[PDB]
Amino acid sequence: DFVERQQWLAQPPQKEIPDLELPVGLVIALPTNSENCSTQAICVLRVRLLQTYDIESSQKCDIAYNFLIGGDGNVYVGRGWNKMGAHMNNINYDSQSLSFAYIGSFKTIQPSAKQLSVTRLLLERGVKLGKIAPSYRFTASSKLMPSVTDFKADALYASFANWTHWS
Amino acid sequence: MVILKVAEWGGRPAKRMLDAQQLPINRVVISHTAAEGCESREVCSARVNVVQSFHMDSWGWDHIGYNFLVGGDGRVYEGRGWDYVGAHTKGYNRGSIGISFIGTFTTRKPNERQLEACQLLLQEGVRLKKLTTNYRLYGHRQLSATESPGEELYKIIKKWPHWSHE
Numbered sequence: 228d229f230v231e232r233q234q235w236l237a238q239p240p241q242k243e244i245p246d247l248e249l250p251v252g253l254v255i256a257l258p259t260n261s262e263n264c265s266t267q268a269i270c271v272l273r274v275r276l277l278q279t280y281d282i283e284s285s286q287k288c289d290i291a292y293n294f295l296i297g298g299d300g301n302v303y304v305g306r307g308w309n310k311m312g313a314h315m316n317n318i319n320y321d322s323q324s325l326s327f328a329y330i331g332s333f334k335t336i337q338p339s340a341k342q343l344s345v346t347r348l349l350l351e352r353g354v355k356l357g358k359i360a361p362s363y364r365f366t367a368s369s370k371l372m373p374s375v376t377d378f379k380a381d382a383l384y385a386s387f388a389n390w391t392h393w394s
Numbered sequence: 395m396v397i398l399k400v401a402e403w404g405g406r407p408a409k410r411m412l413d414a415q416q417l418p419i420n421r422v423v424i425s426h427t428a429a430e431g432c433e434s435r436e437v438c439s440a441r442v443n444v445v446q447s448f449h450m451d452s453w454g455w456d457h458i459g460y461n462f463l464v465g466g467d468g469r470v471y472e473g474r475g476w477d478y479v480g481a482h483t484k485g486y487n488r489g490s491i492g493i494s495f496i497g498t499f500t501t502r503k504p505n506e507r508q509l510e511a512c513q514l515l516l517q518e519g520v521r522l523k524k525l526t527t528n529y530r531l532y533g534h535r536q537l538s539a540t541e542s543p544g545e546e547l548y549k550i551i552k553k554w555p556h557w558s559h560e
């Protein structure tokens with residue numbers, strides 16, 4: 228159910244990446260704005276190509292996200308539980324959160340039921356491992372930075388609107 | 395020199411019959427895998443299996459795309475071999491041999507054993523008449539829009555006698 232970096236042909240990070248102070252009180256949802264995927268083989272393609280984009284176009288040290296969730300319902304390991312992401316391009320947020328990126332574009336298209344159910348298991352695993360505070364807030368990247376067009380994903384965020392930890 | 399056949403590193407056969415090359419070949423294209431390197435038969439075999447899956451399952455190609463790969467253990471991992479057209483350099487697969495260094499060589503050099511393996515592989519190709527005596531060698535980036543084979547690896551092969559900018 229977790230696809231490790233090695234399984235998606237991850238490039239090793241360019242330089243050292245800072246550790247997060249754990250546990251985090253904030254988990255942030257984002258779209259990848261890539262094409263989506265419904266099988267591990269295609270999700271792997273999506274994630275590996277996003278890593279290149281993030282490193283080579285965005286000049287990040289690594290894929291921008293802690294975890295990525297594919298339409299197949301698998302969790303793709305990005306920077307993982309312990310390393311600071313680069314999802315908000317803002318050190319205040321990035322140093323105090325984990326990011327879950329949803330593989331696809333979700334302005335009008337909804338995530339799959341698999342994507343939503345594994346998010347529950349992923350959040351629970353994080354709480355159990357001491358990575359996420361029991362009283363965490365789960366929120367949309369777009370709520371935090373309304374002006375950022377690439378964070379918009381109305382159909383994704385609407386899917387979490389009734390969850391108890393959602394803000 | 396060790397060349398491990400597809401079966402010997404635990405890989406799959408081609409999905410269908412591949413196109414054969416006219417021998418001898420006088421173009422070689424050096425790439426890297428842009429994933430993690432490896433220092434042992436076990437780890438390098440693992441890396442090459444993942445590469446094969448990426449090429450056959452994620453891209454949907456008929457086999458691993460390289461003719462050969464070179465591991466940080468100093469072993470050569472057979473892909474399509476000398477006699478078949480690869481899927482490594484678009485527009486240049488026919489009439490070339492694609493060799494990939496296992497790893498990412500953007501800011502780190504390939505290791506002593508990896509470089510030695512590649513030199514021996516090329517000399518073996520000339521000796522067997524798979525390659526011309528005056529074959530031209532290129533970095534992937536000269537033929538395709540890419541970082542491959544990585545700046546540090548590219549700087550090394552640019553000083554090899556067969557290197558060409560034509």
Ligand SMILES: CC(=O)N[C@H]1[C@H](O[C@H]2[C@H](O[C@H](C)C(=O)N[C@@H](C)C(=O)N[C@H](CCC(=O)N[C@@H](CCC[C@@H](N)C(=O)O)C(=O)N[C@H](C)C(=O)O)C(=O)O)[C@@H](NC(C)=O)[C@@H]3OC[C@H]2O3)O[C@H](CO)[C@@H](O)[C@@H]1O
Nearest residue numbers: 425427428455456457481482483484485487538540541542
């Ligand atoms: C750090 C780095 O090198 N990054 C590069 C990055 O490198 C990638 C990296 O790419 C490495 C360097 C590589 O060696 N890629 C080769 C396999 C590749 O994709 N080459 C394509 C050609 C593929 C090809 O020829 N496919 C056949 C498929 C044929 C299918 C079937 N007929 C068969 O024979 O099986 C084809 O289209 N042939 C036609 C007929 C032709 O020759 O005109 C090219 O450069 O044009 C990938 N690793 C592997 C192991 O595939 C992985 O995915 C993203 C990253 O990590 O590539 C992107 C472009 O996508 C570049 O912008 C980046 O700078």
Ligand SMILES: *[C@@H]1O[C@H](CO)[C@@H](O)[C@H](O)[C@H]1NC(C)=O
Nearest residue numbers: 263264265298299336338339
């Ligand atoms: C991926 O996107 C396509 C096109 O919008 C859609 O039809 C398909 O159901 C999506 N696959 C998923 C979410 O698994």
Ligand SMILES: *[C@H]1O[C@@H](CO)[C@@H](O)[C@H](O)[C@H]1NC(C)=O
Nearest residue numbers: 385386387388389390391392
């Ligand atoms: C909100 O989603 C509904 C379905 O759209 C309900 O099924 C559900 O009770 C609620 N989500 C949960 C379980 O928190």
